[PDB]
């Protein structure tokens, strides 16, 4: 499939070009919504914890996925467990309300509350990228904030996530050849 | 819908569960689908 | 009087990836509109194919330039997405999430040498199971493919999927060093006043490549 | 036999704020008649906006005096439901129970001189990101507008609502002093024996004036 | 209705959940729509 | 306002082979396709019965030679799936996991002389509750049936099932020696220059074989 | 179907429960019941 180098027009070449039957496609496995509908475990603030989506490791599934998209939607979805009363206030909430019950706090039960949570940002889209400066990414941009005695643990869950114009992402650079890690074998 | 698989209709509202969405007044997949291909090629046997 | 039920043991666990929906717990929000924006993917590979990326030769380049020597081999590497060439392609980015994966490999070939430059290239695919070919002769009773250098700058080739199963692992395991899914081999038929002129190359999925399992692999 | 079912971790925490009904405890009572009572208000966003409320300008005052030196400046505040200015009025009351607000704030003026008294007043709207404007002048290339005392002594004017995002907190940040909506100034461009001549100043909700995600943030 | 949000019917009977009200023999919504508008004046282009 | 519900004792244990299904955990998996294979079999006492197995005479051979002598007992052993002579057939290894059967047992006789040889064999059938026969003459009067050596080398014949009860047990008890379901006994009629040639016999489920209540008896 | 028993319809989808199949474009029982019965023989009273 010879065709026009520097146009940047998409050219699929299939197998057929030599003989040849190009076979069945299923990609539910690699849809945004799907993927990246998990439980990612971030590593808290022992007290006050803004519920950013930045905050997620960006080493991992669903920290590094998230982080192709640059502008994103997604409702949340956290799990958390605590020591008290947790208490999520909104987004754009003085952090002194923080401390009022009022506001959807969730008596402890064991051994995790996990509640889901409304996408509250004024922006119509968030963005995991932001050059109003060339870390160091809007106050706006966040899902509200939670507090308890002792949270310990944290896990974040998009849900009917969106995501707009992908960005790299980068795979482990390997020495050798091949990056030749231990596959689980019986 | 996404990664979530139950029959049973949900037991919440809906405006309860997610945010609701509003309309005012995709693309990779076009451009995927677009793709020319075979051949620019006056092919032979 | 009230409805009997049997609390049952080994259910109902958190579990970290099941389906069911949280409880909710602050209501009647109704978000900005975002309908028609720009450049919405949903689904990664509609993204990895629609845009391919750069492969990664010695010294860290995206080209292989030629040569006039006696060798003829402008490259050769295992077929595998953990491979060090694939190592910064959005492809083996992407494939680092799952285990395994099926279908063809497209690999576009853009030479970008001077006008009165001129090329052969080759490109065969040797299966596993055999020493992967050292010349061109010998590759040339491969699914081997050929063209040369013209107005027309560009060159795909899928890379075709064989194997005795019906998928194939993302990753190479650390005891495997035979290499299982066979080698891709670049010639340089020949080169017409051509040397030190790049070909550069770039990688993407075909219609019919899949990837499946996702896992998180620590993978940085 | 019976139904199984599985009872599962992380739901049904009390929580708060949840919808769910309590279960009921004592029946079947029947309350006095209340129907067709007086005065009834279903939406705190009516009663905002049919009600307009005074503003506070320096001394504590509702009013502002005109005045007879070179400067025109009568006020001139921070777009912020938190402001000093809008402390005393409803909506500013009401505001700091929700997190953030979008769309249009009235502000009507009038003027409570002799009949002897005359004046023209101006109110621009300067957006963020430069100065506000310390003359009349210069504020003339705003969102002006500008009236005169007459037979009818009233006049009011709709803050446009105007940001890149589509709402707006409604609390100030301790760190930001800049202003992020930007200020409302208004002028006097002349006055006739009008010297010590108050023009009241009230506030409220226009048509399209929404809050939205309520939060207790102390707010005493 | 409220702050409530569940589509499945309310297990308990209705007058054993709430308390029942009674006929015998809204304001402000209208005054806020009854707000004049626009101008007193004769505009001009 | 919540559905009450009450959670009963007694229930829900986990219990090894209770019919419930698991709660699933990671979804949308599709598997290669596999229609059409070869070999399949939905049912173990349909390769039971499609393909019968040796038996085991004494130094561990599954023939039963002729015999020179007055004797005429070719062989003799309890109906008993859990017998010696049947512990290597399938039919016995697959009856160690099911507590009790039912109907018939074939049993194939199939000749291996030369063919010069020739002879008449008997088998048959006594019930318990006396003593099992030693000569071919008293046998005469139980169910037997008596072929010979020809052009055909198989002969097939069904052990008939009596018993009082409905079913009766795989397996022998400790306690009981008498044999409950009574002999077969393998006679030799007479034989004709056949000395020392082979009978090799082998058996499978009939039509109405049954096997029911599975069961772990250790059983190696 | 196999060692499951409730009339109740299943809470989960179906692609989350089990592995869903693909066709592509048994033989004991054929085997048993092709099985030849009674006699080559010509049987006698």
């Given at each position: 499939?010879?065709?026009?180098?520097?146009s940047?027009d998409?050219?699929?070449?299939?197998?057929?070009?030599?003989?040849?039957?190009?076979?069945?496609?299923?990609?539910?496995?690699?849809?945004?919504?799907?993927?990246?509908?998990?439980?990612?475990?971030?590593?808290?603030?022992?007290?006050?914890?803004?519920?950013?989506?930045?905050?997620?490791?960006?080493?991992?599934?669903?920290?590094?996925?998230?982080?192709?998209?640059?502008?994103?939607?997604?409702?949340?979805?956290?799990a958390?467990?605590?020591?008290?009363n947790?208490?999520?206030?909104p987004?754009?909430?003085?952090?002194?309300?923080?401390?009022?019950?009022?506001?959807?706090?969730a008596?402890?039960?064991?051994?995790?509350?996990?509640?889901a949570?409304?996408?509250?940002?004024?922006?119509?889209?968030?963005?995991?990228?932001?050059?109003?400066?060339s870390?160091?990414?809007?106050?706006?941009?966040?899902?509200?904030?939670?507090?308890?005695?002792?949270?310990?643990?944290?896990?974040?869950?998009?849900?009917?996530?969106?995501?707009?114009?992908?960005?790299?992402?980068?795979?482990?650079?390997?020495?050798?050849?091949?990056?030749?890690?231990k596959?689980?074998?019986? | 819908?996404?990664?979530?698989?139950?029959?049973?209709?949900?037991?919440?509202?809906?405006?309860?569960?997610?945010?609701?969405?509003?309309?005012?007044?995709?693309?990779?997949?076009?451009?995927?689908?677009?793709?020319?291909?075979?051949?620019?090629?006056?092919?032979?046997? | 009087?009230?409805?009997?039920?049997?609390?049952?043991?080994?259910?109902?666990?958190?579990?970290?990836?099941?389906?069911?929906?949280?409880?909710?717990?602050?209501?009647?929000?109704?978000?900005?509109?975002?309908?028609?924006?720009?450049?919405?993917?949903?689904?990664?590979?509609?993204?990895?194919?629609?845009?391919?990326?750069?492969?990664?030769?010695?010294?860290?380049?995206?080209?292989?330039?030629?040569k006039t020597?006696?060798?003829?081999?402008?490259?050769?590497?295992?077929?595998?997405?953990?491979?060090k060439?694939?190592?910064?392609?959005?492809?083996?980015?992407?494939?680092?999430?799952?285990?395994?994966?099926?279908?063809?490999?497209?690999?576009?070939?853009?030479?970008?040498?001077?006008?009165?430059?001129?090329?052969?290239?080759?490109?065969?695919?040797?299966?596993?199971?055999?020493?992967p070919?050292?010349?061109?002769?010998?590759?040339?009773?491969?699914?081997h493919?050929?063209?040369?250098?013209?107005?027309?700058?560009?060159?795909?080739?899928?890379?075709?999927?064989?194997?005795?199963?019906?998928?194939?692992?993302?990753?190479?395991?650390v005891?495997?060093?035979?290499?299982?899914?066979?080698?891709?081999?670049?010639?340089?038929?020949?080169?017409?006043?051509?040397d030190?002129?790049?070909?550069?190359?770039?990688?993407?999925?075909?219609?019919?490549?899949?990837?499946?399992?996702?896992?998180?692999?620590?993978?940085?």
């Amino acid at each position: 499939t010879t065709s026009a180098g520097e146009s940047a027009d998409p050219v699929t070449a299939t197998v057929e070009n030599y003989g040849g039957e190009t076979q069945v496609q299923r990609r539910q496995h690699t849809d945004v919504s799907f993927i990246l509908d998990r439980f990612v475990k971030v590593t808290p603030k022992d007290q006050i914890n803004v519920l950013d989506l930045m905050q997620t490791p960006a080493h991992t599934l669903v920290g590094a996925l998230l982080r192709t998209a640059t502008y994103y939607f997604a409702d949340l979805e956290v799990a958390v467990k605590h020591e008290g009363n947790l208490t999520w206030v909104p987004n754009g909430a003085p952090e002194a309300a923080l401390d009022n019950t009022t506001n959807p706090t969730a008596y402890h039960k064991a051994p995790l509350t996990r509640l889901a949570l409304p996408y509250t940002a004024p922006h119509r889209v968030l963005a995991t990228v932001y050059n109003g400066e060339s870390r160091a990414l809007p106050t706006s941009f966040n899902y509200g904030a939670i507090k308890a005695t002792r949270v310990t643990e944290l896990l974040y869950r998009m849900k009917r996530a969106e995501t707009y114009c992908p960005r790299p992402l980068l795979a482990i650079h390997p020495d050798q050849a091949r990056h030749k890690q231990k596959i689980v074998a019986p | 819908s996404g990664n979530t698989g139950s029959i049973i209709n949900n037991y919440y509202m809906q405006q309860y569960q997610n945010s609701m969405d509003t309309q005012l007044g995709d693309w990779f997949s076009k451009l995927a689908s677009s793709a020319f291909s075979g051949l620019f090629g006056a092919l032979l046997a | 009087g009230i409805f009997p039920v049997a609390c049952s043991d080994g259910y109902g666990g958190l579990v970290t990836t099941d389906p069911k929906t949280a409880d909710p717990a602050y209501g009647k929000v109704f978000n900005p509109p975002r309908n028609m924006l720009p450049g919405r993917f949903t689904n990664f590979l509609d993204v990895a194919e629609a845009c391919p990326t750069f492969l990664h030769f010695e010294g860290d380049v995206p080209y292989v330039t030629t040569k006039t020597d006696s060798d003829r081999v402008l490259a050769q590497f295992d077929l595998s997405l953990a491979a060090k060439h694939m190592s910064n392609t959005f492809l083996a980015g992407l494939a680092q999430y799952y285990t395994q994966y099926s279908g063809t490999i497209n690999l576009h070939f853009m030479f970008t040498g001077p006008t009165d430059a001129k090329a052969r290239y080759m490109i065969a695919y040797a299966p596993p199971g055999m020493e992967p070919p050292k010349t061109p002769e010998a590759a040339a009773h491969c699914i081997h493919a050929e063209w040369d250098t013209g107005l027309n700058s560009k060159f795909t080739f899928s890379i075709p999927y064989l194997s005795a199963a019906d998928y194939t692992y993302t990753a190479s395991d650390v005891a495997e060093t035979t290499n299982v899914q066979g080698w891709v081999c670049l010639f340089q038929i020949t080169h017409g006043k051509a040397d030190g002129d790049a070909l550069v190359v770039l990688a993407s999925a075909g219609k019919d490549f899949e990837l499946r399992l996702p896992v998180d692999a620590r993978t940085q």
